[PDB]
Design an enzyme around this catalytic site. Structure first.
Site, mmCIF file in Angstrom:
data_model
loop_
_atom_site.group_PDB
_atom_site.id
_atom_site.type_symbol
_atom_site.label_atom_id
_atom_site.label_comp_id
_atom_site.label_asym_id
_atom_site.label_seq_id
_atom_site.Cartn_x
_atom_site.Cartn_y
_atom_site.Cartn_z
ATOM 1 N N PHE A 189 7.263 -15.208 6.850
ATOM 2 C CA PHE A 189 6.948 -13.978 6.174
ATOM 3 C C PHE A 189 8.087 -14.033 4.996
ATOM 4 N N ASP A 192 -7.985 17.624 0.338
ATOM 5 C CA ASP A 192 -7.565 16.631 1.261
ATOM 6 C C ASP A 192 -6.037 16.650 1.789
ATOM 7 N N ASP A 233 0.731 -1.208 -0.025
ATOM 8 C CA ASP A 233 0.150 -0.080 0.066
ATOM 9 C C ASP A 233 0.809 1.360 0.186
ATOM 10 N N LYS A 234 1.921 1.482 0.868
ATOM 11 C CA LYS A 234 2.882 2.448 0.852
ATOM 12 C C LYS A 234 3.409 2.530 -0.475
ATOM 13 N N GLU A 247 -3.771 7.588 -9.084
ATOM 14 C CA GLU A 247 -4.068 6.478 -8.353
ATOM 15 C C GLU A 247 -3.258 5.454 -8.731
ATOM 16 N N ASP A 293 0.191 -9.763 -1.214
ATOM 17 C CA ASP A 293 -0.991 -8.906 -0.744
ATOM 18 C C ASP A 293 -0.975 -7.827 -1.677
ATOM 19 N N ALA A 294 -2.079 -7.228 -2.284
ATOM 20 C CA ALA A 294 -2.494 -6.342 -3.140
ATOM 21 C C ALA A 294 -2.201 -4.947 -2.513
ATOM 22 N N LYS A 336 5.748 -4.186 8.936
ATOM 23 C CA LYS A 336 4.829 -3.458 9.830
ATOM 24 C C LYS A 336 5.377 -3.536 11.413
ATOM 25 N N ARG A 360 -4.493 3.909 1.288
ATOM 26 C CA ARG A 360 -5.065 2.622 2.310
ATOM 27 C C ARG A 360 -4.296 2.657 3.464
ATOM 28 N N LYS A 361 -3.405 3.812 3.891
ATOM 29 C CA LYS A 361 -2.668 4.067 4.975
ATOM 30 C C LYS A 361 -3.009 5.317 5.435
ATOM 31 N N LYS A 365 -6.517 19.981 -4.255
ATOM 32 C CA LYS A 365 -7.039 18.922 -3.654
ATOM 33 C C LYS A 365 -6.840 19.270 -2.116
ATOM 34 N N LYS A 379 -2.279 13.684 -5.125
ATOM 35 C CA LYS A 379 -3.039 14.851 -5.333
ATOM 36 C C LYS A 379 -2.203 16.045 -5.266
ATOM 37 N N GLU A 394 -6.386 10.847 -13.197
ATOM 38 C CA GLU A 394 -6.652 12.223 -14.221
ATOM 39 C C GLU A 394 -5.554 12.914 -13.796
HETATM 40 N N1 LIG Z 1 3.163 -13.946 6.067
HETATM 41 C C1 LIG Z 1 2.970 -13.135 6.541
HETATM 42 N N2 LIG Z 1 3.100 -12.793 7.996
HETATM 43 C C2 LIG Z 1 2.832 -11.652 8.276
HETATM 44 N N3 LIG Z 1 2.593 -10.559 7.943
HETATM 45 C C3 LIG Z 1 2.365 -10.633 6.451
HETATM 46 C C4 LIG Z 1 2.418 -11.945 5.859
HETATM 47 N N4 LIG Z 1 2.670 -11.370 4.665
HETATM 48 C C5 LIG Z 1 2.105 -10.346 4.408
HETATM 49 N N5 LIG Z 1 2.253 -9.689 5.638
HETATM 50 C C6 LIG Z 1 2.021 -8.187 5.978
HETATM 51 O O1 LIG Z 1 0.785 -7.534 6.266
HETATM 52 C C7 LIG Z 1 0.376 -6.631 5.156
HETATM 53 C C8 LIG Z 1 -0.819 -6.431 5.186
HETATM 54 O O2 LIG Z 1 -1.433 -5.121 5.706
HETATM 55 P P1 LIG Z 1 -2.672 -4.302 5.445
HETATM 56 O O3 LIG Z 1 -2.532 -3.543 4.010
HETATM 57 O O4 LIG Z 1 -2.830 -3.490 6.514
HETATM 58 C C9 LIG Z 1 -4.109 -5.549 4.908
HETATM 59 P P2 LIG Z 1 -5.315 -4.978 3.935
HETATM 60 O O5 LIG Z 1 -6.378 -6.382 4.260
HETATM 61 O O6 LIG Z 1 -5.101 -4.906 2.624
HETATM 62 O O7 LIG Z 1 -5.900 -3.806 5.034
HETATM 63 P P3 LIG Z 1 -5.766 -2.202 4.811
HETATM 64 O O8 LIG Z 1 -7.343 -1.738 4.562
HETATM 65 O O9 LIG Z 1 -5.318 -1.931 6.143
HETATM 66 O O10 LIG Z 1 -5.062 -2.106 3.830
HETATM 67 C C10 LIG Z 1 1.271 -7.096 4.016
HETATM 68 O O11 LIG Z 1 1.285 -6.042 3.136
HETATM 69 C C11 LIG Z 1 2.577 -7.284 4.896
HETATM 70 O O12 LIG Z 1 3.122 -6.299 5.322
HETATM 71 N N1 LIG Z 2 -18.138 18.025 -11.951
HETATM 72 C C1 LIG Z 2 -18.137 17.631 -10.521
HETATM 73 N N2 LIG Z 2 -18.732 18.439 -9.739
HETATM 74 C C2 LIG Z 2 -18.861 18.220 -8.265
HETATM 75 N N3 LIG Z 2 -18.426 16.944 -8.019
HETATM 76 C C3 LIG Z 2 -17.799 16.158 -8.831
HETATM 77 C C4 LIG Z 2 -17.381 16.571 -10.060
HETATM 78 N N4 LIG Z 2 -17.114 15.484 -10.842
HETATM 79 C C5 LIG Z 2 -17.000 14.699 -9.780
HETATM 80 N N5 LIG Z 2 -17.360 15.007 -8.841
HETATM 81 C C6 LIG Z 2 -17.538 14.017 -7.386
HETATM 82 O O1 LIG Z 2 -16.479 14.258 -6.724
HETATM 83 C C7 LIG Z 2 -16.116 12.585 -6.249
HETATM 84 C C8 LIG Z 2 -14.560 12.689 -5.544
HETATM 85 O O2 LIG Z 2 -14.778 12.005 -4.495
HETATM 86 P P1 LIG Z 2 -13.512 11.267 -3.515
HETATM 87 O O3 LIG Z 2 -13.437 9.929 -3.896
HETATM 88 O O4 LIG Z 2 -13.773 12.048 -2.147
HETATM 89 C C9 LIG Z 2 -12.229 12.237 -4.429
HETATM 90 P P2 LIG Z 2 -10.383 11.485 -4.111
HETATM 91 O O5 LIG Z 2 -9.530 12.840 -4.361
HETATM 92 O O6 LIG Z 2 -10.252 10.419 -4.690
HETATM 93 O O7 LIG Z 2 -10.553 11.662 -2.458
HETATM 94 P P3 LIG Z 2 -10.538 10.574 -1.446
HETATM 95 O O8 LIG Z 2 -9.276 10.125 -0.870
HETATM 96 O O9 LIG Z 2 -11.610 10.967 -0.423
HETATM 97 O O10 LIG Z 2 -11.061 9.430 -2.363
HETATM 98 C C10 LIG Z 2 -16.415 12.209 -7.413
HETATM 99 O O11 LIG Z 2 -16.299 10.448 -7.411
HETATM 100 C C11 LIG Z 2 -17.696 12.558 -7.786
HETATM 101 O O12 LIG Z 2 -18.866 11.971 -7.078
HETATM 102 C C1 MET Z 3 -14.068 15.989 -7.768
HETATM 103 S S1 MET Z 3 -13.464 14.356 -8.230
HETATM 104 C C2 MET Z 3 -11.910 14.507 -7.237
HETATM 105 C C3 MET Z 3 -10.848 15.157 -8.126
HETATM 106 C C4 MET Z 3 -10.478 14.548 -9.492
HETATM 107 N N1 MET Z 3 -9.660 13.371 -9.342
HETATM 108 C C5 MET Z 3 -9.458 15.684 -10.174
HETATM 109 O O1 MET Z 3 -9.075 14.888 -11.244
HETATM 110 O O2 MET Z 3 -9.537 16.710 -9.965
HETATM 111 C C1 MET Z 4 -1.357 -10.260 6.125
HETATM 112 S S1 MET Z 4 -1.722 -9.399 4.540
HETATM 113 C C2 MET Z 4 -3.458 -9.260 4.581
HETATM 114 C C3 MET Z 4 -4.296 -10.526 4.279
HETATM 115 C C4 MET Z 4 -3.963 -10.976 2.842
HETATM 116 N N1 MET Z 4 -4.333 -10.019 1.718
HETATM 117 C C5 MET Z 4 -5.008 -12.110 2.659
HETATM 118 O O1 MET Z 4 -5.013 -12.827 1.443
HETATM 119 O O2 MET Z 4 -5.254 -12.928 3.826
HETATM 120 K K LIG Z 5 -9.844 9.595 -7.338
HETATM 121 K K LIG Z 6 -4.549 -5.851 0.511
HETATM 122 MG MG LIG Z 7 -11.589 8.795 -4.247
HETATM 123 MG MG LIG Z 8 -3.633 -3.148 2.445
HETATM 124 MG MG LIG Z 9 -4.201 -2.594 7.962
HETATM 125 MG MG LIG Z 10 -12.962 12.659 -0.535
#
Ligand SMILES: Nc1ncnc2c1ncn2[C@@H]1O[C@H](COP(=O)(O)CP(=O)(O)OP(=O)(O)O)[C@@H](O)[C@H]1O
Ligand SMILES: Nc1ncnc2c1ncn2[C@@H]1O[C@H](COP(=O)(O)CP(=O)(O)OP(=O)(O)O)[C@@H](O)[C@H]1O
Ligand code: MET
Ligand code: MET
Ligand SMILES: [K+]
Ligand SMILES: [K+]
Ligand SMILES: [Mg+2]
Ligand SMILES: [Mg+2]
Ligand SMILES: [Mg+2]
Ligand SMILES: [Mg+2]
Ligand SMILES: [Mg+2]
Lengths: 392, 389
Positions: B238, B279, B17-18, B43, B246-247, B169, B252-253, B277, B273, B56
């Protein structure tokens, strides 16, 4: 009377990040329906004319990933490039593999560990929160933003506002008063909606329709006054939406999934995760704990943290804070919570019936928030009785 | 003495994720370096043998997305299928398009709106937090988990523990005392590390090495005692890690990026961003405000919320809460914060110099946390003087 302003937002089911949560959880549903012991870690992302499902699944289920993706997109209303994604034209990429054997041995012993020995599927921390300010024991800022987003979907689907497209967002600023640590809503300060629309509607029509059909029916009249601020499609045009306007990903709405910025978050996403993932089962159980403390009249507000280590069944830490609203001390509430709730993932799964998928059991959690809902599938919304010396 | 336990985690730069956050911000850096007015919403996701950059970007920059992706993976140590991703062999997918014209007209008038007229690039809310419990005005549970993760990367790179692989971690449980709303750390209750490793090391060697080379150098001795609990690679293996195990996905952090569960989070991700933004620019400014309230001695702890509407320059709401540690009322601290800080995004961008990329300006924020860092590129860590009595 001293007050402060607190803001929560929501998005509806057509928001591209929420689409990803719903596809991830549609995949979880499909696995569990055939194999309740499914190990599921299903991530989704989307951009113009593309959905990808990726991550790790070990299941005896026979799953059509493409169908689940296209079906989910279709039902939410992504049925043309005109509304920001065509379920029946878009590229569907699949990069699903089995769970790491290194994870599987440690967590569940490749499906041999007994329930009480199942380890946390990962490390992390999770919070549950409850507040007596609404009947569902959720924060009014969150509830109002969420219910407005659901009403926005409803008036598109029911044909009241024919100009709407699926992708919409809401944000509500509530003016609050602190009553001895309890949160007392005074009035709604600012209401915002940004919703996707067709080319047939003026900004005056959008503003009229959003106020009359969407906002007024949801916000209690007692919270609205002549000074309440309205931002209604402030960008001036929102024709392009869904994945076309903005990339979506699973787990990018974790605050909209939970308490709208109230209580706390440990940072773990919910959607696409089977219940060995304490990100989900842990958060559900500490919501059940926080809600139970408040519903039993032990406190007006409650925050519970749990944390885990991968491979270890028992939590590393538990805390309870009632923001000074507890009718007994927090140390005694912590002792009751730990005697009442089993935080072991193998136990949480069975005690909340989390290995049941189908009839969109988890797909329903993936839009309009995981908490404060009355559907019986939300098993963690069920209040547990607590043993304590309840005032006369 | 009445106490409670509070837990925060971290991941290091090799967590998948990082990795995504760092790729997203490496793309932002590369755009800004050529075009400071780049509109960037990049992204990233990763799974076995695959990285995808998507979202974008409107930029005058000429960008090699594939090179940035492979260079970022290479620098973190993803150089073979053996350590969970091969920077030189993995598939790199690109689905980058220009920003929606509907957004562009509303936010910045297709690069015509003056700074004071720039609207929030989206709606949302952001919190800033500061606590006097550490010199960096950050929560000790977060700081210890973060610094332990950084030490874990350091001992791999410097050849102190040659069995380590990039993905790791941490989690630290701190026993705290509440001093009239201020947080006073008592002792470290539980330390956890899970780190990726080669086949050449035993679990006893892992535990010894992690205690001696990673934990003992980082946790102040005053916080460690004979009752401190250690979980060291509790899964027992590990070897498979990174995208292979792990995807990963950008954003996601967000709690590891911020306060480890302390203060609050509005849910917006930072990485990939540009500063329209809110955010990102909004969270940076409210950290500067919270930190400034505490560093000026106005409070021992401070939480600040701001919220926005897309297309509107001025915030919809601002609040300050000092958890009852304020030496003047919160209403008066709110008035001073609003007189001192400009929350309009076009002004925040200039005031914090956020259109400068290069020397990995934003890539460095994308691991080990956005806040509590001393690097002068972290412009929001600069304390502002506040006028008060
Ligand atoms: N065999 C193993 N034993 C222990 N930890 C492991 C492992 N394989 C992977 N991991 C660690 O667990 C991490 C998962 O962390 P997270 O990203 O927090 C899981 P997630 O389900 O994607 O939740 P999230 O919503 O917090 O992202 C891996 O990316 C890695 O650092
Ligand atoms: N022209 C427009 N006017 C207003 N809102 C718009 C827009 N085009 C898109 N949006 C809205 O703005 C949303 C963006 O929401 P977020 O997902 O919060 C932005 P992000 O940069 O991905 O931050 P996040 O970390 O919260 O996901 C789009 O998915 C849509 O619902
Ligand atoms: C309002 S939608 C979130 C921002 C958008 N991803 C951009 O390209 O600016
Ligand atoms: C410890 S990594 C997070 C969970 C892992 N994605 C699984 O398939 O279980
Ligand atoms: K986005
Ligand atoms: K994952
Ligand atoms: Mg978003
Ligand atoms: Mg994760
Ligand atoms: Mg986690
Ligand atoms: Mg948002
Ligand atoms: Mg076909």
């Amino acid at each position: 009377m001293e007050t402060f302003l607190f803001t929560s937002e929501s998005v509806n089911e057509g928001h591209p990040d929420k689409l990803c949560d719903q596809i991830s959880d549609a995949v979880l549903d499909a696995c569990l329906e055939q194999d309740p012991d499914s190990k599921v870690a299903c991530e989704t992302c989307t951009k113009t004319n593309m959905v990808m499902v990726f991550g790790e699944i070990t299941t005896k289920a026979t799953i059509d990933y493409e169908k689940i993706v296209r079906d989910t997109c279709r039902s939410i209303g992504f049925i043309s490039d005109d509304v920001g994604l065509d379920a029946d034209k878009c590229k569907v990429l699949v990069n699903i593999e089995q769970q790491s054997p290194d994870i599987a041995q440690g967590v569940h012993g490749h499906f041999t560990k007994r329930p009480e020995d199942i380890g946390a599927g990962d490390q992390g921390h999770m919070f549950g929160y409850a507040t007596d300010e609404t009947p569902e024991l959720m924060p009014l800022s969150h509830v109002l933003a969420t219910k407005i987003g659901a009403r926005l979907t409803e008036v598109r689907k029911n044909g009241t506002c024919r100009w709407l497209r699926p992708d919409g967002k809401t944000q509500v600023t509530v003016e609050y008063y602190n009553d001895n640590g309890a949160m007392v809503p005074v009035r709604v300060h600012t209401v915002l909606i940004s919703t996707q629309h067709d080319e047939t509607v003026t900004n005056d029509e959008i503003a009229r329709d959003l106020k009359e059909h969407v906002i007024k029916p949801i916000i209690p009249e007692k919270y609205l006054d002549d000074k309440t601020i309205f931002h209604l499609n402030p960008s001036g045009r929102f024709v392009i939406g869904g994945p076309h306007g903005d990339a979506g990903l699973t787990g990018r709405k974790i605050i909209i999934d939970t308490y709208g910025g109230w209580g706390a978050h440990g940072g773990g996403a919910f959607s696409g995760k089977d219940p060995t993932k304490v990100d989900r089962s842990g958060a559900y159980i500490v919501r059940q704990a926080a809600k139970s403390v408040v519903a039993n009249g032990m406190a007006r507000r409650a925050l519970v943290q749990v944390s885990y280590a991968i491979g270890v069944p028992e939590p590393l830490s538990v805390f309870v804070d009632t923001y000074g609203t507890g009718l007994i001390p927090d140390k005694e509430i912590l002792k009751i919570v730990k005697e009442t709730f089993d935080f072991r993932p193998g136990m949480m799964t069975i005690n909340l019936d989390l290995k049941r998928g189908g009839n969109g059991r988890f797909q329903k959690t993936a839009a309009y928030g995981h908490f404060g809902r009355d559907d019986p599938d939300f098993t963690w919304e069920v209040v547990k009785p607590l043993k304590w010396d309840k005032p006369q």
